[PDB]
Design a protein around this ligand. Sequence first.
Ligand SMILES: O=C(NCCOP(=O)(O)O)c1ccc(OC(F)(F)F)cc1
Ligand SMILES: O=C(NCCOP(=O)(O)O)c1ccc(OC(F)(F)F)cc1
Ligand SMILES: O=C(NCCOP(=O)(O)O)c1ccc(OC(F)(F)F)cc1
Ligand SMILES: *Cc1c(COP(=O)(O)O)cnc(C)c1O
Ligand SMILES: [Cl-]
Ligand SMILES: [Cl-]
Ligand SMILES: [Cl-]
Ligand SMILES: [Cl-]
Ligand SMILES: [Cl-]
Ligand code: NA
Lengths: 393, 253
Amino acid sequence: TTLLNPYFGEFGGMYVPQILMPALNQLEEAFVSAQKDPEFQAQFADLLKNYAGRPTALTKCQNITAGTRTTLYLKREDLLHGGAHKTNQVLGQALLAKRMGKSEIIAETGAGQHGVASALASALLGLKCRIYMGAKDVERQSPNVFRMRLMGAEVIPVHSGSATLKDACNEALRDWSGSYETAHYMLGTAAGPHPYPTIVREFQRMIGEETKAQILDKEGRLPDAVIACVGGGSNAIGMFADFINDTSVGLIGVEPGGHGIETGEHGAPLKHGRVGIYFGMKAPMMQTADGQIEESYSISAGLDFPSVGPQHAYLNSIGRADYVSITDDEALEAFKTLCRHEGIIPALESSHALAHALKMMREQPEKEQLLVVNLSGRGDKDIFTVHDILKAR
Amino acid sequence: MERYENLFAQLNDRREGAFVPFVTLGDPGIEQSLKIIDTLIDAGADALELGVPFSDPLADGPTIQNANLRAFAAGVTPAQCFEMLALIREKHPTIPIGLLMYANLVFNNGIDAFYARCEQVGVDSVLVADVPVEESAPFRQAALRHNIAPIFICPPNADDDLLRQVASYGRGYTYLLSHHLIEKLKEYHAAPALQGFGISSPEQVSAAVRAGAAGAISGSAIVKIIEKNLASPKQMLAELRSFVSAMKAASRA
Ligand SMILES: O=C(NCCOP(=O)(O)O)c1ccc(OC(F)(F)F)cc1
Ligand SMILES: O=C(NCCOP(=O)(O)O)c1ccc(OC(F)(F)F)cc1
Ligand SMILES: O=C(NCCOP(=O)(O)O)c1ccc(OC(F)(F)F)cc1
Ligand SMILES: *Cc1c(COP(=O)(O)O)cnc(C)c1O
Ligand SMILES: [Cl-]
Ligand SMILES: [Cl-]
Ligand SMILES: [Cl-]
Ligand SMILES: [Cl-]
Ligand SMILES: [Cl-]
Ligand code: NA
């Protein structure tokens, strides 16, 4: 039995070996308790305000929209401590771990941002943090690895399988199945087995709550659409959650198109993968015809989780949210555009969301539309990537 | 077919436990895997547990992860696994054959079609490693519709509700992880228990049976002999033969 529904329509669930079920059940009980505890809420809100810097700004982009009938705002998760939205939910999950009397955190990371977010939350709250990272990733994300180690986390390179994110996920879970009495597994997106899609949404929902308050204050109405990139689904579901019941507000999720959907080299499982069961959940994923799990490809490594959160698959199926893709080249153009016209360097992840909004504006410049893009992170980390591409051109 | 029921009845008559090797199909290649399996049987394996190579074998340790990698290096696919299974059953009509599967391979071309394929090639049971009993309904129903026993892990800390579910839903045998659980399972009329995980010596086989389990499963110990002897397939088979013979002897009355 569970306290909460582990499924969103046919998607989600708890597809883990039997030995991990007590860990998930314990976590669900702790979360349900925490959500009813005003003291927990107050402590979380306090860290978000006074450590992470919430609320984040909502910035209008007149320079980009000039001469069209689009009004565009960026929700500034790039201004959160750590430079990306991932900080919100790691602080909530670190508090949950403390609530459960856990003194140790396990996390996975691919492009290193969840690793850094987990390490900073663990440093603040005095937890012993160990991070699993595919050896290939350890090699290509040395700045992030160095950050994790500065913050006192142990970074464990994963050699098994293909030595990437999914192998790091597997090592984290194997460890947790043995250590869950004393360690919490701080999963890095709104995916994996229940209760993680639910917990991560709830600990990111202030993105959309704030956006709603700020847009009402500045424009006196709700947005026509909110737009967010979708790697695993956390920043998008955090922006979307408070608007789900506002049926006039469009919810647009942007998966990475990589070199183009037709090339096969993309990271868009929701719209171009096939439902499977892996990562503890039933969800669309990148997989071979005979059911071996594959990789997502994007210029942005942070969008490379090869499946997607089950609530996104559900919101798509019922037509409440629409999902699209943006290619590497479109993301690069949006990155350049924001730097030049607003003086903001966006994460290449977030640049996928911005690119779609720019398309919405440019394709129909006399359409009245009030848009919010979730600017999930800053793009300092991407300047070498962008430099190298632009130089080879 | 009731191959597990028949085996356990026969073993019971002989006051004997089952010894059940675990190997990965197609490790280290198709032809050598078939030989390995024939060797395990000819050395006295009572039943088999066989893994289908999967990209992300979460619930397996390094030895078996490596076995999967070896099989993939040989280009082994689930389709090839099913061809091997048919050939194995064709050679060996009575030995119970159980698969250790991950959910995606079962769900991939449709859960019903997967179990129908198991029935066609003469498999007896399927343990889906990453389907907990709480979410097993479509799997165990499809299994039973196709005369396949669904196998469930019973963890050493299992609570009473979990014991009751495992006893009700499982068939063939209960997979018990390494005397109280054994007695509760018997109380709740569960399928006979096989003890698995870290069984690597005759003494542990004997201990499992003495505790009241119907037998013991060994995988890492067996696959290590494969890994050890990759360069010498002939010696590989001799060493497998002597190890299985010793382990089987330890189950005898
Ligand atoms: O996408 C995931 N992690 C995000 C890592 O973020 P980053 O450091 O930016 O790669 C992620 C991790 C685990 C997972 O489920 C399960 F645990 F079952 F494997 C699903 C998704
Ligand atoms: O089976 C396990 N251990 C070793 C036995 O397998 P193998 O050594 O491959 O025969 C094993 C280890 C961890 C586990 O939990 C989870 F996968 F979720 F992390 C489940 C099973
Ligand atoms: O039978 C298995 N392994 C062989 C016996 O263990 P060992 O001798 O230690 O390799 C075996 C059974 C189940 C399993 O996954 C899960 F537990 F989740 F269901 C993994 C390995
Ligand atoms: C990790 C990351 C993402 C992608 O993860 P989601 O869970 O899909 O939000 C997006 N933007 C930034 C800046 C990230 O660091
Ligand atoms: Cl508020
Ligand atoms: Cl309000
Ligand atoms: Cl106003
Ligand atoms: Cl200018
Ligand atoms: Cl029952
Ligand atoms: Na994805």
